[PDB]
RNA sequence: GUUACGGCGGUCCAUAGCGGCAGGGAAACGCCCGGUCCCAUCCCGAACCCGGAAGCUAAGCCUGCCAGCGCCGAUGAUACUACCCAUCCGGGUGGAAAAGUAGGACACCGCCGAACA
RNA sequence: AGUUUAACUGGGGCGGUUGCCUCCUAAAAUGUAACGGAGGCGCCCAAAGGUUCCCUCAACCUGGACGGCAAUCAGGUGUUGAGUGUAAGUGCACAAGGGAGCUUGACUGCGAGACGGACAUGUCGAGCAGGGACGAAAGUCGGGACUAGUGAUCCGGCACCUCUGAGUGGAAGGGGUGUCGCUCAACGGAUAAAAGGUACCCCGGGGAUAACAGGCUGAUCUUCCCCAAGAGAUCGACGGGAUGGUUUGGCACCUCGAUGUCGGCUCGUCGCAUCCUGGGGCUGGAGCAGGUCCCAAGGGUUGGGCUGUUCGCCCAUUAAAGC
RNA sequence: UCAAACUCCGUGAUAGCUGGUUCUCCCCGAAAUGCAUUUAGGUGCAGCGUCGCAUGUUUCUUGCCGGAGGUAGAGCUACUGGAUGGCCGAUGGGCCCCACAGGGUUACUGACGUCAGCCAAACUCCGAAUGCCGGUAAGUCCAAGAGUGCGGCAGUGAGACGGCGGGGGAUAAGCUCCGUGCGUCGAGAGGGAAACAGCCCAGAUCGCCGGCUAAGGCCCCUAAGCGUGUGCUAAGUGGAAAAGGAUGUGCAGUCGCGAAGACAACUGGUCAAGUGAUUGUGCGCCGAUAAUGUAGCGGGGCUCAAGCACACCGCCGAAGCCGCGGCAGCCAACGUGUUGGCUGGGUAGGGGAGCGUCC
RNA sequence: UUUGAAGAAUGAGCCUGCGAGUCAGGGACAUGUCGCGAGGUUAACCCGGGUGGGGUAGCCGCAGCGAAAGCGAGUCUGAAUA
């Protein structure tokens, strides 16, 4: 038969979720498209991979119809 | 309100959850019995092991 | 503070849209006049830009009213389902749709600025 | 003469496959097998890269010389159904889709923090410095909407370095930085270099593992039955529901520190789905004789030609020459 | 003795293979998975055990809170595909005219659509429950003998069956391949299922001629009820099976006809109360059917139930729990070894402490 | 040996003897214990009828970074205190 080939799973998804801290640079979701877009202190990287630009809590949230991540800055102590 | 819960099932063949809330609750073999308060808390203990404990409100 | 007013923003971005009917030009918003200057057409001053204000609210715009099209949308019940009983059939505790219906809806809020006090 | 001649395989052989990317299987995080189901890749682009600015399709309707369903032109409707270099998917109309101007960031030194992971690989990344592109500026630019377009180590080649230089000065050679050379495609790559036969076979294991027999199931076989389209009591199509392990099958639980493989002879035993004999029923039974269907397993059920045969065909019989 | 003799030597050749490996007790206690592999019965790393050290509840359970899904379900003029009750309707060909230009008629072929009804692993305008990530409050806490890191020593890397969700095969297999804070066996004795690794109850430290129970049972075998009350079954159903067939019977619901005389019997007469078809139901009947011997209740036997349904009352029943006594490991308290609380099935394997033999 | 064997998978007629994790090396890692301790220790060899005494050659600690030249509580990369 012909069938037989594949390719390797990608380990895409979310990686954090709400109420998470994180700190700068860390990243959020592993997506392929624009699934998700880049919120506030959310930057988008070559392969489209969302990322925390500031430390803080991950917040997701629609902003005019798009599902998009954000980054609350948590109280300092 | 307080409430006595006593074991009346064994742990074999049980789920690691079920098993987790009987050692939650305080006992360890078959009629044993525990006298815990009325809450939200207990109330989901007995929930998720009904069928291995008899409730009794004291 | 007020006006059928002009902008700049919002909201899990239509409950807001579209359509229909009836209105207006105070300052503004426009349409409008022309290509002399900056600038422009893969050709075209149509557009972009510039210089003006003779004319006009017919349009844009916004005001009022229409559920018409779209849109939003319960409760209940059911499907489904976690756990547990049950020799199958099915049952108990909990969670609980989509669709449909009742209904809502012809947007609401913020900051400036015009004209008036 | 010394050796090599891969693995997967519902037992083997022919065949196909081996790395990377996309979807389903996959059970709403991730991951998840099959010789399971669908496809693609081993590139391409000097612009299809960077930046600044501008634009919005496809389809339909109407009207236009050739011109037509369909070329180019005009008006209207048209919120995404077009297109995105290339599979599929996730995206993109705010455009990542179409056009133009300048340009080379398809940079150098780096890199907080992370994702993914047996390890080796792999992936993202703000920000800092140098020197630039575009832009009035804010700013963006460390190739391309994203995810494939690839090969470790060893060994060797080339360019540069304020490295080393076997007594000394050199040089040779070595070293660092940048980079080149592998369908090593069996794609974590046993050698730089490798095909076959054995029924002349040998050894050690394995029922992981099969061959004959069983244990299970039933594609197939057979014994029936269900409705009745019909032909005309008897046959019953088209469809449908059951037994059996008497057929070939499927699985490999059973044995490879041995379970003889077909027929025949000798000797059995059992079932009844009855060939004869026994008892009935209806006859499309006049009688004879049959058809056909019930009950019935006591006994009986031939000898030869051909073939190793079972099977089969034939020759003579017989009450009958059963399965 | 011959597809390369025999002897000695290299030599104690080499075998990812087969077999074997010898005293005791105490504590803990797996795996049959992932990746790679001249790899598949081997091995390396990881996963899971044990010992030591360090760290403390960081592990786990339950409640609440913050999150992302595209499964089940559902839906579809919300898309893409297959469709339909497939309707007209294209498109082509024949037929009729005969021109062959032009044409029309279908048993013609008959596009898409759509009033409406459908379907979908590779469809989605929707969309759960569980599960997963984080936060938070408690629980357990003289214990889970929990997590995490580092080091010493490993074994394992052929799993099996049962329950749920799927693929392959003919949804056939006691077939095969995956998922499952699913279970058990493996490595688990005891009780039950006649016997019965994987099913049900329950996890064995030792002793007792004590008690209470679980599953399963209580006529006799065989411990405990030929138990009580209300009903059903005639089939030994119970104590195996389908399509289908069938005046069995209990209950309930309807309707038709009927004292103007109902049905049967003998449109009109005699006669004398029910007489007809269903509807769902609880048990029953044929279907039913192979070859050693009853053989499809474990046996005897049982309807005078010892069968079934529903209520009720007892008892039997294990190494489970309790009672009394002995021992051991861990920890705690106070002490200068007592007491107390938990724990003590176990293969591979890890650690600790000992018996016996000889010099 | 196995997923699983009371056996219809393996082996064993019986008894008594015999029969399987050992040794070497200043080897390597870990962990006990003893001596000395910023030091510890000798090898060959020499002298003792011994198991005792001597023997500093070496070895391991005592500074690291860098390919190396080299610098050094710093060092490498780098134009850079970046």
Do not use: C, M, Y
């Amino acid at each position: 038969s012909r069938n037989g080939r594949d390719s390797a799973a990608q380990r895409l998804g979310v990686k954090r979720f709400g109420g998470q801290v994180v700190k700068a640079g860390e990243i959020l979701v592993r997506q392929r498209g624009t699934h998700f877009h880049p919120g506030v202190n959310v930057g988008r990287g070559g392969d489209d991979t969302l990322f925390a630009l500031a430390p803080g809590a991950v917040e997701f949230g629609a902003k005019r119809g798009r599902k998009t991540v954000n980054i609350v800055p948590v109280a300092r102590p | 309100a307080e409430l006595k819960i006593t074991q009346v099932r064994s742990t074999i063949g049980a789920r690691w959850k079920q098993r987790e809330s009987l050692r939650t609750l305080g006992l360890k073999k078959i009629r044993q019995s525990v006298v815990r308060e009325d809450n939200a808390q207990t109330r989901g203990l007995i929930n998720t092991v009904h069928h291995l404990v008899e409730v009794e409100e004291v």
